């Protein structure tokens, strides 16, 4: 049987208006016998036809893979608008329906703390700058790292962990060359969450 995947849009996309948030509907393991896939898109019940559908790509048990992407609107998704994808195939007993929407519950602003390089780290060849985030709802968040108005891509961020009370937390960790840190450069911790004024806050870090 063919499985369906309905991905929510990148939290950075839903929070940056210069970007376009999109819900993706992936269909995997689609057979040679019945390879046609018909996508239906719904918003709270109301069907929409604006969606774009890419051609097929090959798979392994000599099968196919189909993808349909639907532009959603920033203000729309953030309200908690329910998005539905109806996938139909001749090899399907019935039409398959997946549903994804921004999580309900009282939204909360994240707190951001910065942890400068450790005493050990400072002896090593590269240092790790750390950014700790806690008390946020929903888990939709986008932590990124920048230095001198340019991106720093050499970082890793844990998935949002559920807090005991009901909020979320995570840790992001940028690894930089020590000489760059020692040279006095400032490194910023960009956090984009729904419950942030202008969806943006920034704590930075310098020697």
């Amino acid at each position: 049987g063919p499985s369906v995947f309905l991905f929510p849009p990148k939290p950075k996309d839903t929070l940056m208006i210069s970007r376009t948030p999109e819900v993706t509907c992936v269909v995997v393991d689609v057979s040679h016998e019945d390879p046609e896939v018909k996508f239906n898109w719904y918003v709270d019940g109301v069907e929409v036809h604006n969606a774009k559908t890419k051609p097929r790509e090959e798979q392994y048990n000599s099968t196919y893979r189909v993808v349909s992407v639907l532009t959603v609107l920033h203000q729309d998704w953030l309200n908690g608008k329910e998005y539905k994808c109806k996938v139909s195939n001749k090899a399907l007993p019935a039409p398959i329906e997946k549903t994804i929407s921004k999580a309900k519950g009282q939204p909360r602003e994240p707190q951001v703390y910065t942890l400068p390089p450790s005493r050990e780290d400072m002896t090593k060849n590269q240092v790790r700058l750390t950014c700790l985030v806690k008390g946020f709802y929903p888990s939709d968040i986008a932590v990124e790292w920048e230095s001198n108005g340019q991106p720093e891509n050499n970082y890793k961020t844990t998935p949002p962990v559920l807090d005991s009370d009901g909020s979320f937390f995570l840790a992001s960790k940028l690894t930089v060359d020590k000489s760059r840190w020692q040279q006095g450069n400032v490194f910023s911790c960009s956090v984009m969450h729904e419950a942030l004024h202008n969806h943006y806050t920034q704590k930075s870090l310098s020697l």
Binding site: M16, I17, E144, G149, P151, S190, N198, H199, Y200
Partner: peptide
Amino acid sequence: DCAWHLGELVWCT
């Protein structure tokens, strides 16, 4: 007021 991110606009209140 508008917050930006590395050149691209984030959000305006």
